[PDB]
Amino acid sequence: QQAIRLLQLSTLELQQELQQALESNPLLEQTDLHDEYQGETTQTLQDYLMWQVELTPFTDTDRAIATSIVDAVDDTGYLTIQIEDIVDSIGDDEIGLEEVEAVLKRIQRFDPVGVAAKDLRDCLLIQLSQFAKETPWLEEARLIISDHLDLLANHRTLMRVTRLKEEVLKEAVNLIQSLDPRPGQSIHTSEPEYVIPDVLVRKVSGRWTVELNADSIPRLKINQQYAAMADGQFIRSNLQEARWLIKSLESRNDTLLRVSRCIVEQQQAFFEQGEEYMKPMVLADIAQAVEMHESTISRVTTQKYLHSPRGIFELKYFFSSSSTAIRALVKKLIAAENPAKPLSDSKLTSMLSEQGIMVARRTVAKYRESLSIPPSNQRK
Amino acid sequence: VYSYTEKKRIRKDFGKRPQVLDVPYLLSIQLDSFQKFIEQDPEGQYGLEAAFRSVFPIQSYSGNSELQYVSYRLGEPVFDVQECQIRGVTYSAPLRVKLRLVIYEREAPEGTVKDIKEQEVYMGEIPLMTDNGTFVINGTERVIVSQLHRSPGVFFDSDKGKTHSSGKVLYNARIIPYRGSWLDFEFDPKDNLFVRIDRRRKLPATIILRALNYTTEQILDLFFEFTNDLDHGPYISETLRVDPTNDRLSALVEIYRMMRPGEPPTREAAESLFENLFFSEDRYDLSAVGRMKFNRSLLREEIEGSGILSKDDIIDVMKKLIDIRNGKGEVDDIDHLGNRRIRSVGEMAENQFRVGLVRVERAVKERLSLGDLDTLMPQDMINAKPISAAVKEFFGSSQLSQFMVQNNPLSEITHKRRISALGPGGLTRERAGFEVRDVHPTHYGRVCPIETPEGPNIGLINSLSVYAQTNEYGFLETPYRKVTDGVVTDEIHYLSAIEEGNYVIAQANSNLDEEGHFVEDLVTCRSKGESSLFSRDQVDYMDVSTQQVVSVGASLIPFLEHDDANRALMGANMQRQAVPTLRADKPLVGTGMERAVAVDSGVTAVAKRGGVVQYVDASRIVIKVNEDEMYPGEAGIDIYNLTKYTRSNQNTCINQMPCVSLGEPVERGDVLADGPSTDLGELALGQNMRVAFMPWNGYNFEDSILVSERVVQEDRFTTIHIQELACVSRDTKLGPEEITADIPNVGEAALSKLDESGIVYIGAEVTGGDILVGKVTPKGETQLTPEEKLLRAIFGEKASDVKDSSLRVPNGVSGTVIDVQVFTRDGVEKDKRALEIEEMQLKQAKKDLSEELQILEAGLFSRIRAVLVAGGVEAEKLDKLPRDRQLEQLAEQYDELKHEFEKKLEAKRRKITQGDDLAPGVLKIVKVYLAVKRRIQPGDKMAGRHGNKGVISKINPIEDMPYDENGTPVDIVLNPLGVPSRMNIGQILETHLGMAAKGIGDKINAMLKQQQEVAKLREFIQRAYDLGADVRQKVDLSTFSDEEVMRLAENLRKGMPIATPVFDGAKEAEIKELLKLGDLPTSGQIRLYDGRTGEQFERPVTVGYMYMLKLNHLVDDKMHARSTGSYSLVTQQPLGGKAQFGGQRFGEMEVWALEAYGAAYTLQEMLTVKSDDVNGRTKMYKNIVDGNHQMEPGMPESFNVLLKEIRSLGINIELED
Amino acid sequence: ERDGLFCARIFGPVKDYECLCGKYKRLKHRGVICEKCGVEVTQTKVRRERMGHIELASPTAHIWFLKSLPSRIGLLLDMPLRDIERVLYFESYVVIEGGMTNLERQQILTEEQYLDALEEFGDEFDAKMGAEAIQALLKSMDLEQECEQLREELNETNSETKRKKLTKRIKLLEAFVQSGNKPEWMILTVLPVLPPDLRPLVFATSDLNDLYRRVINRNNRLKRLLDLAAPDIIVRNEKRMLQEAVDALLDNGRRGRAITGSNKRPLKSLADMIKGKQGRFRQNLLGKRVDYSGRSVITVGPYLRLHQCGLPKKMALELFKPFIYGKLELRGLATTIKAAKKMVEREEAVVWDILDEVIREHPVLLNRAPTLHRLGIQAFEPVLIEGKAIQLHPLVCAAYNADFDGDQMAVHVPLTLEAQLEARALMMSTNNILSPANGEPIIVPS
Ligand SMILES: [Mg+2]
Ligand SMILES: [Zn+2]
């Protein structure tokens, strides 16, 4: 049962298990040992907001209240705590719940304006207070969001409630759409998380090479300076176990390579054009193609991921547990290109067979008729 | 006589010496060498055939699986040079290698079961050189500098003096193979002979010979007849006393314990080790150079032999060590060019490829050992990666492969021509002393004595020579003229470093009149390593030209012999830094080599053929080829596409300007257009102008330069900078990133200058923080809650659940967007913009492929028109009938050609779409470019060719400029005191002659300003090129002097281009004699008047036209300011330079200067509150704004780091008290 | 990954006051460690402070003391170098606690000698090798008896050569005794781990954590190999490699000079983090980079008085920016800081005059790239000049040895008030007219 547990663990989990196993028996990977500076910089996020509290006088007692707010600020820019919950954190009876509103607004007014505001209407309303600038359409605008009339815009239902004049109010709503809802969250240099590919797929010219595999595959060497051959039989028993191990490991990569060839061939229609619209291959169907037992192919299918030109996929999603999609393909193909020579019905069936989609010369005709387009009448 | 270029404008020449051998190809050392690399050579000549044949046939052990190599080929390049340069792929060719697998028979007289000779096995692609002498690996032209190493052979060194404090010196021999382990013999005061493999360790000599199966009786036999201290040293037998080993087995065991110490020795392991060092054919090599210099250095008769060492070689050279040791000489220095070998891209490419072949051979013997019978064929036991992992490791990353310097058209040429003693195989900069740095008399005519870098490496680079050529083996050649008896023959012989040493060679400048017999009683000659006057008839050879000693950067210095050597160095080296100008003015005083430069590099536009130009535009040039040059098939025309406003490695702008008017005959081998810094075939590194040497009230102090406002107004020294700002991401585990098309968090203005696709529009005012490309990115399935539905309702945006990843214009930077490239990873479309670039290239190609149609269809059309007439002639009815209406064959070729149009065009279109190819996970890349015009302004660097630097101090108006009698302003005011100190007097002549060279022009213009008859200007131009008596003018009137020479006027009305060869240039009475022509005084000085006063300056003032060079040091790129930036993480400190975002490094010497002064809080704040301290910086910042200037210093954070770093050892460090 | 070279439990939380599990997020709950994922909610800066430890299955020598010129492991035992080097390399046995059999207490043997000594004296005889041998040898050896033995011996022998090495060694020993370090501590049972933020990742384990990862790995193998009952050759050579890896991790380049993946340069060790670029001189001593500074090309000042120099306008706006903020909000030109910087970013014409106010009597500091004499740094008075180039006075130009051929100058702002005074007092131009080398004028026209 050592081989079966060996195959279907995550490629990251497998190497972790072998690393423990590698310590226990003397076998060695490629060490890249040939025997003969800065990855870091500063960044500011809420630290920017803390620049405010140091320079702006809160005295001492209120500054600690403001420092308690910035922690509650989400990456989105809004407080997780309730205004009475930060009151619990300070653990003082001199906050009054009024003073916290006094400081909370003042840190709201430092750029980004609108920041650190509960319920988002604050953020929009407290956006407007500084934004007021005496003008122009905001007086009617401040009414909508403040009155709880923020049911809209779900949709002129406002007109009955707001009583302002109709079409001119859109010159307010248009001005409302110019407010940033949630400053300032901005992109850090996180790649972000990239899923290390198991296998690989791409197409060299006029062909599909599923050859894989990324550098995930461990390269193990069983040879060391202990080639010397109760003590001695232990090293023979362990070397025997380690020689079986590399064999079982090499078979895993050999199986992944094979299974990948047959799962891409069966599904190529999805692979070639777009996503979904995958012919539902069954584990047994692939299990029939090659000797592998369905239990072994289900296991290898579980956690070993797949890189595709479009997206990355678990290889378990390839499994599952029509006319409209082909019509759009026909439309897309015939509408595309055809600069001088129209695309003949025979050519479409050839193109679709080449990509793996199976359609008859007669069915392409009926699909094109249902599209309402006459074949080949259009020309230069 | 003159080329169709000189028909436009000709450059006069000064001086005497005739040119027997014209200037050779400047790109030779590159093009010819890489040509010798990749070639089909039916013999052992170096190349792919060489490494390939030598590593082959690869045979297994007794398996008779031997894999044989036959031949090879390079498939047509997958992408052309122009397309591969835009995309960033490698410009290369597939290597198709014929292999033959013959399986033998089991225990027979070489039978064959079956032979699978399988068709081409594909091993990688290899980088192809251009006609520029350059390579394209990714997107950029790069150069591989030729190297210089110790020539394979036997080295004889000394190490006298300081070795051990006795002054008794030493005799240490050595052996330097091309491949394999080194060899050394080191002598000690104890005098015993010590042999060493590599640098490893010291062993008594007996361990080598006895290991070769030599008993004691045969040791003392070879090296002795004899104990004598003044003649025959008993050194071998004095070494034999410290000998531990009595026989072969013992010596081999001790060797195996030497090379690999710390492991139990055996017999068979030692035998294979020692036999695999200097003996085995696989590990050790000499080849053609090693046995050559080996023999000649050993005084041997045979000039060739095996590439391996034998007992006779070892004992031979060992005897040579004893001969040189006792009383006999002589020492061989490492300086002589006979001990120096040059390596070129071809040779090193063959070596790396060979490494790939041996590393794959190691894997071939295995699969051929353990395999079965006929199944596996070539393409099975041979892979691709083992090859490209070598050749790419060389071309891609190597100390000898450096980015081409593309700013200055002179820099590419002086780059591809170079020498480097550093790098692989040669001495480094941390070891080799002043010896190899200095100049050797053998450098004459080969290595440029002047042009070398100044800095940590001096003399470790140097340069080539104008006429220099690569020697057959490793050496350098110099051109020489054969002088037999008293007749100097026109045969140009080539002598190597050691060859030339023994002959007696005269000098290129020696006066011979009449039929070329030496007039002098005794001419100067160089016999051996020295120079002196020699007998009249004793001349063996004579130098070809006076320029053969110097290089391109040297020869391009006017009046070189006038300037001091140091300032000549500085000047020629500064010349390579000159930035391209907006308008290229040819130098008024040149060397004549400018044409030999501008043409020798791809910066210009050459001509495959000639004949009248068809279509001349600012983009393309179409030529009609004549019949004599044109090939019979396909006929054809010459289509040229000029590169317009493209980037460069220096952030400069490269652009082509068509120089042909229209409808004009051209000659093959002529310039159709002009690239950057090239004026009508003449190399223009910059512009010249009016200079006057006077003190101005102190803005000219030292090298500071005063420039008139007229210069910055006329927009001459202005340059065009192009920067490449690129953005690519997508592919996140949360889903792909989309490029713009919506970008929440920004208002209307940002989206206004971005196209509907989301790319920036072509052209814009872009500065500061603008958005070049919108870039988004998801986070996903945030729980909506009641709140986010409201959020997604009212705005909703994208829907904007997603962050802003955008590429934005870097702050403090600006420009204008010109060109945008997109590479879309295959399988992912783009909405519009990408389709617009694809379609744009498609139309640019389609209208071009119609030229081979409309021209050929019209010609074959007229051919139909001719044949049908004898067949039913109607001329007018032929005009009448439509164009669509032997007949067999002609009607056939029509259809075939049309179909060819179809398939060719379609192939090009698919080629446009398919290759974007990018990295895994890279989805879409956008390369955006920004072009700005950077003018001149105080602080910018400006210098001459003569070694005078400069920095513009103030830009003075046209008023304050001192002016002459006619009121002409001076362009640049420079300091007189710089010349008598720097000892560069060439800049004094280049000015004076300039005043003459400009003066004639100023007259010519005036004479054309009065629009006289064709005859008067004809006579005056006759006089202009006549001047002082002699040579070598070959004056005008040869062609038509009316319509043909009229254009020679318009080009002369600016100035009069003049050629001043290096040592053949002008002279005093020549300059004065040309100054007499228009009107000028002999002193070269006139009267000036201050524009701020109107009075006269006492004494004369030297004025003229001097050539100025604008380097790229420009202030705008340098000046920096930092108040508070981002800090470092590990140790909280300011960042990486003057360059963003950091601030100037305040060093320990600055701390010493602060320690000298009583300044205490200054140093304290310097290393505490300003930078290092974590809290002190912020608590200080909250002060500075408040208006209270004070500090709460605390302790530096990096000391708190040092505490933990020491605490990571077994050491404890605390803080007490 | 928990219990790795980077972990929250071993060191600290990734996010400020946040858990790895997410139960404890706000700064309400601080001191509490966790219910589930082991972490303590705390500032993230404690991840650059706290250290871990690695337990070695076998003892290990500290290569710093062995390779020191007066080798502290060998000279403490009065043992030579080449020998103790043979002992720790597992290339020979050493005798410890000789007892009464035949041999000495410190003597060195070989294989056939070791077994030959075991066949006759089977018990009451002890000889071993490796770091354990030097450990127990150093521990059993004590300095109490050597004081009296040495001193009395010094009285006994009548030659200087007899007692010279005696008094030398005995003084070294008793000073060692007073120090508080006992010799047993040069054999490391545990190893310290540098905080994660002092050896930051690039996601490529590097230089360092590469080394640490080697020592960890190869050591864990030994920890499992002892319990797995493996012969003497295997565990012997892997103990040797454990010593090798700790050697490289502590101070590389002493013997093996292991070099990181993709080669060729040897990976930097912990001593290389002290012995630095040229040294730790880079940061602590040489004061590294400094804020409120910048450079640009230098041109002529002929219109300047001796006490003043030119400065770029756009550069001065950045240099004095923190002063310009406060001076702006002090006049009421800007409400708060955010609007103040928002104004200086727009470069509104009102702020240049504010700058003119704070830059008038406020001195600056120039300097050249090379600095020799104390006059190499001279403070002048700033004069706003339009351009990107800095202007220097020609009289003091002879001090810097500054040619106008394209050299650059560095500027500095004396922020704290005392510094503002020291810049105009002892650092000014007029106050140094005479070179400290010679009392002759340094201002002399050129
Ligand atoms: Mg200088
Ligand atoms: Zn937790």
Between helix A98-109 and helix A61-72 the angle, nearest 10°, is 70
Tell me whether residues A192 and B777 touch, CB distance under 8 A.
yes
Annotated binding site of C: 19, 21, 34, 37, 403, 405, 407
- Number of C-beta neighbours around residue C256 at 10 A: 16
Question: How do C258-259 and A34-35 pair as beta strands?
Answer: antiparallel
The CA distance from B372 to B366, in Å, is 12
Both structure tokens of C426: 């002892």
Per the DSSP assignment, residues forming a β-bridge with C361 are: none
The CA distance from B1056 to B686, in Å, is 16
Hey, is B395 helix, strand or coil?
Answer: helix
Tell me, in angstroms, the distance from the centre of ligand 1 to residue B699's CA.
17
- Count how many pairs of residues, chain A against chain C, have C-beta atoms within 8 Å: 69
Tell me, in angstroms, the distance from the centre of ligand 1 to residue B947's CA.
12
CA atoms within 13 A on the CB side of A220: 22
Hey, is C207 helix, strand or coil?
Answer: coil
Decide if A110 contacts C336 (C-beta within 8 A). Answer: yes
Both structure tokens of B920: 């895994």
Which residue in the set C299, C410, C414 is minimally distant from B704, CB to CB? C299
In the block, tokens 């005859």 appear at B1015
Q: How far is CA C261 from CA B355, B376, B393, C218, C267, in A?
A: 20, 34, 15, 17, 9
Decide if B783 contacts B776 (C-beta within 8 A). Answer: no
Q: In one letter, which amino acid is C125?
A: F
Which residue in B641, B837, B669 sits closest to B757, CA to CA? B837
Residues 1115-1134 of B with CB under 8 A from C: 1115-1116, 1118-1125, 1129-1131, 1133-1134
The CA distance from B282 to B269, in Å, is 17
DSSP string for A305-358? -EE-SS-EE-SSTTS---HHHHHHHHHHHHHSS-SSSPPPHHHHHHHHHHHT--
Question: How do B704-708 and B951-956 pair as beta strands?
Answer: parallel
| End-to-end CA separation in angstroms for chain B | 95
Those residues with Cβ within 8 angstroms of residue B329's Cβ, 6 or more apart along the chain or in another chain: none
Considering every ligand atom shown, identify the ligand nearest to the alpha carbon of residue C8 and give its number. Answer: 2
Q: Which residue of chain C comes nearest to B262, CA vs CA?
A: C91
The CA distance from B1174 to B1138, in Å, is 22
Tell me whether residues B1165 and C427 touch, CB distance under 8 A.
no
Decide if A342 contacts A378 (C-beta within 8 A). Answer: yes
Q: How far is CA B485 from CA B290, B521, B528, B538, B543, in A?
A: 37, 14, 19, 7, 16
Which residue in B452, B471, B474 sits closest to B339, CA to CA? B474
> Of all residues in chain B, what percent are helix, strand and coil, respectively (each to 5)?
30, 20, 50
Considering every ligand atom shown, identify the ligand nearest to the alpha carbon of residue C20 and give its number. Answer: 2
Q: In one letter, which amino acid is B769?
A: G
Question: Is A112 in the B-facing interface, judged by CB distances under 8 Å?
Answer: no
Sign of the C-alpha dihedral computed for residues C248, C254, C259 and C265 taken in this order: positive
Decide if A286 contacts A297 (C-beta within 8 A). Answer: yes
Per the DSSP assignment, residues forming a β-bridge with B641 are: B620
Both structure tokens of B218: 């045969």
In the block, tokens 């060299």 appear at A204
Q: How many residues does chain A have?
A: 380
Decide if A271 contacts A199 (C-beta within 8 A). Answer: no
Both structure tokens of C11: 């060191």
* φ/ψ (deg, to 5) at B1039: -85, -175
Tell me whether residues A186 and B803 touch, CB distance under 8 A.
yes
Rg over alpha carbons for chain B, rounded to the nearest Å, is 37
Bin A337: left if φ > 0, else alpha if -120 < ψ < 50, else beta.
Answer: left
CA dihedral B217, B221, B226, B231 (to 10 degrees): -140
Per the DSSP assignment, residues forming a β-bridge with B691 are: B972, B1104
The CA distance from B49 to B38, in Å, is 9
Per the DSSP assignment, residues forming a β-bridge with B932 are: B721
Residues 632-661 of B with CB under 8 A from C: none
The CA distance from B1153 to C439, in Å, is 18
The CA distance from B591 to B556, in Å, is 5
Decide if B4 contacts B670 (C-beta within 8 A). Answer: yes
Element (H, E) at C113: helix C111-120
Hey, is B533 helix, strand or coil?
Answer: strand
In the block, tokens 């590469």 appear at C210
The CA distance from A182 to A122, in Å, is 11
Which residue in B957, B667, B655 sits closest to B818, CA to CA? B655
Which residue in B1103, B1100, B1104 sits closest to B997, CA to CA? B1104
Question: Is A204 in the B-facing interface, judged by CB distances under 8 Å?
Answer: no
Q: In one letter, which amino acid is B642?
A: L
Sign of the C-alpha dihedral computed for residues B1039, B1042, B1047 and B1050 taken in this order: positive
Residues of chain A in contact with residue C16, where contact means CB-CB under 8 angstroms, are 71
Between helix B986-1009 and helix B1068-1075 the angle, nearest 10°, is 20
The CA distance from C446 to C444, in Å, is 6
The CA distance from B849 to B901, in Å, is 7
Cβ-based interface (< 8 Å): residues of A facing C: 19, 22-24, 26, 32-40, 52, 55-56, 68, 71-72, 80-81, 85, 88-89, 109-111, 225-226, 228, 231, 234-235
Q: In one letter, which amino acid is B507?
A: Q
Q: In one letter, which amino acid is C404?
A: F
Per the DSSP assignment, residues forming a β-bridge with A35 are: C258
CA atoms within 13 A on the CB side of B1209: 24
Which residue in C311, C307, C310 sits closest to C395, CA to CA? C307
Both structure tokens of A364: 């392409």
Q: How far is CA B767 from CA B930, C310, C388, in A?
A: 10, 27, 18
The CA distance from B1144 to B1167, in Å, is 13
CA angle A156-A158-A163, nearest 5°?
105
Considering every ligand atom shown, identify the ligand nearest to the alpha carbon of residue C22 and give its number. Answer: 2
Question: How do B704-708 and B203-204 pair as beta strands?
Answer: unpaired
E strands along chain A, which residues?
A: 28-29, 34-35, 220-221, 306-307, 312-313
Rg over alpha carbons for chain A, rounded to the nearest Å, is 33
Sign of the C-alpha dihedral computed for residues B267, B268, B269 and B274 taken in this order: positive
What does the H/E/C string look like for A153-219? Answer: CCCCHHHHHHCCCHHHHHHHHHHHCCCCCCCCCCCCCCCCCCCCCCCCCECCCCCCECCCCCCCCCC
Decide if A7 contacts A252 (C-beta within 8 A). Answer: yes
Decide if B74 contacts B93 (C-beta within 8 A). Answer: yes
Residues 1132-1151 of B with CB under 8 A from C: 1133-1135, 1138, 1142-1151
Both structure tokens of B213: 């199966």
Decide if B409 contacts B597 (C-beta within 8 A). Answer: yes
Decide if B186 contacts B170 (C-beta within 8 A). Answer: yes
Those residues with Cβ within 8 angstroms of residue C363's Cβ, 6 or more apart along the chain or in another chain: C379, C380, C381, C382, C414, C420, C423, C424, C427, C428
CA atoms within 13 A on the CB side of C102: 13
Both structure tokens of A380: 């230069």
B1007 alpha-carbon distance from chain centroid: 46
The CA distance from B670 to B1077, in Å, is 33
Element (H, E) at A130: helix A121-131
Question: Is A339 in the B-facing interface, judged by CB distances under 8 Å?
Answer: no
Element (H, E) at B925: strand B924-934
The CA distance from A252 to B435, in Å, is 61
Question: Is B1186 in the C-facing interface, judged by CB distances under 8 Å?
Answer: yes
Those residues with Cβ within 8 angstroms of residue C143's Cβ, 6 or more apart along the chain or in another chain: C173, C174, C176, C177
CB contact burial C202-233 (16+ within 10 A = b; e otherwise): eeebbbbbbbbbbbbebbbbbebbeeeebeee
Per the DSSP assignment, residues forming a β-bridge with C266 are: C259
Considering every ligand atom shown, identify the ligand nearest to the alpha carbon of residue C400 and give its number. Answer: 1
Hey, is B1133 helix, strand or coil?
Answer: coil
Q: In the CATH hierarchy, which fold is given to the domain comprising B720-835?
A: OB fold (Dihydrolipoamide Acetyltransferase, E2P) (2.40.50)
Both structure tokens of B781: 């399935």
Which residue in B828, B848, B844 sits closest to B836, CA to CA? B844
| B519 CB-contact burial (10 Å; exposed 0-12 / middle 13-18 / buried 19+) | exposed
H-assigned helices in B715-772: 748-752
Hey, is B786 helix, strand or coil?
Answer: helix
CB contact burial B866-884 (16+ within 10 A = b; e otherwise): eeeeeeeeeeeeeeeeeee
Bond prior to C99 in cis (omega within 30° of 0): no
In the block, tokens 């220095």 appear at B333
* φ/ψ (deg, to 5) at B559: 55, 50
Tell me whether residues A56 and C337 touch, CB distance under 8 A.
yes
Element (H, E) at B500: helix B497-502
Element (H, E) at B150: strand B147-150
Interface partners of B (3+ CB pairs, < 8 Å)? A, C
Decide if B501 contacts B510 (C-beta within 8 A). Answer: no
| C120 CB-contact burial (10 Å; exposed 0-12 / middle 13-18 / buried 19+) | exposed
Decide if B176 contacts B153 (C-beta within 8 A). Answer: yes
Those residues with Cβ within 8 angstroms of residue B529's Cβ, 6 or more apart along the chain or in another chain: B441, B501
Say which DSSP state B550 is in: S
Decide if A29 contacts A218 (C-beta within 8 A). Answer: yes
Tell me, in angstroms, the distance from the centre of ligand 2 to residue C40's CA.
8
Decide if B914 contacts B826 (C-beta within 8 A). Answer: yes
Both structure tokens of A210: 């599923």
Q: How far is CA A351 from CA A360, B427, B904, B1136, C24, in A?
A: 12, 62, 22, 56, 58
Tell me whether residues B951 and C292 touch, CB distance under 8 A.
no
Sign of the C-alpha dihedral computed for residues B259, B262, B263 and B265 taken in this order: positive
Q: Mutation target for A interface from B794, B918, B1172, B1192: give the one with most A CBs within 10 A.
A: B794
Tell me whether residues C270 and B1209 touch, CB distance under 8 A.
yes
Considering every ligand atom shown, identify the ligand nearest to the alpha carbon of residue C19 and give its number. Answer: 2
Q: How far is CA A135 from CA A168, A172, B970, C336, in A?
A: 15, 11, 59, 22
Resolution of this entry in Å? Answer: 3.8
Q: Mutation target for A interface from C221, C222, C252: give the one with most A CBs within 10 A.
A: C221
The CA distance from A124 to A117, in Å, is 9
CA angle B839-B840-B845, nearest 5°?
95
Rg over alpha carbons for chain C, rounded to the nearest Å, is 33
The CA distance from A131 to A114, in Å, is 10
Between helix A294-303 and helix A231-272 the angle, nearest 10°, is 80
The CA distance from C42 to A132, in Å, is 41
Element (H, E) at B553: helix B552-555
Both structure tokens of C410: 């560095």
Tell me, in angstroms, the distance from the centre of ligand 2 to residue C48's CA.
20
The CA distance from C17 to C28, in Å, is 9
Say which DSSP state B758 is in: S
Both structure tokens of B208: 């080598």
CA dihedral B282, B287, B293, B298 (to 10 degrees): 50
Question: Is C263 in the A-facing interface, judged by CB distances under 8 Å?
Answer: yes
